Symmetry: C3
Subunit: 90 residues, 3 copies
């Protein structure tokens, strides 16, 4: 298992001092469809955005989705048992 907590990249949403523009931006769809080439060069915004999206979704999967799915699993069984046992007592 992974040994360390999962940090987000460029978590904050602020204007960078060097640029004065938001630290993250969506890459243009055309670039997503194909990616970089020899001559083409990466921009800071897209670079930060990709890693930020990856880390944020990893958080949402690990620390959010599984815990609540487990809680729902337990709750479903508890409610089913209650419903059945009511009739059984009847």
């Amino acid at each position: 298992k992974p040994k360390d907590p999962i940090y987000v990249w460029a978590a904050a949403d602020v204007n960078l001092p060097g640029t004065g523009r938001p630290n993250k931006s969506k890459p243009i769809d055309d670039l997503l469809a194909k990616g970089y080439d020899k001559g083409q060069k990466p921009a800071a915004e897209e670079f930060n955005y990709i890693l930020n999206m990856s880390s944020a979704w990893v958080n949402w999967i690990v620390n959010e989705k599984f815990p609540e799915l487990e809680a729902e699993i337990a709750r479903l069984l508890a409610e089913l048992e209650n419903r059945i046992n009511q009739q059984l007592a009847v």
Copy 2:
């Protein structure tokens, strides 16, 4: 939760005029184990391949495995309840 739909990097596979090669190529396992070092500058194919990996698999997890899993658990609970219902009916 994050407010952007998961976009798979380099989803399409095509030849790039700059390289003439497929947009994604598998890094040699030596590099996978090792990684980069100062002075190295990545080849576009490996970069695209890695990002496509990390994005496509998160997309799969979010949009295929879970929507399947909640439906499956719900159906399992419903079928167990149904069976107990036929058992009670008599």
Copy 3:
């Protein structure tokens, strides 16, 4: 489903051949909150560390966490069915 058998990037933990420092290092939270700015010089250490984190956390979820949850669901359903079966037999 993705065709890629995901692999861990920089899975080996050794010092760099040209630099005595390790091949991976956690970026300072200062950078994690902001992201690379104009004119910054990315180091292979941070790139390798983040890719390692992402890849390891993806494959852990894919290969371990889901089979565990499925086995737990199956066992819970079987035991729950058995309880009511026994009680209705009584």
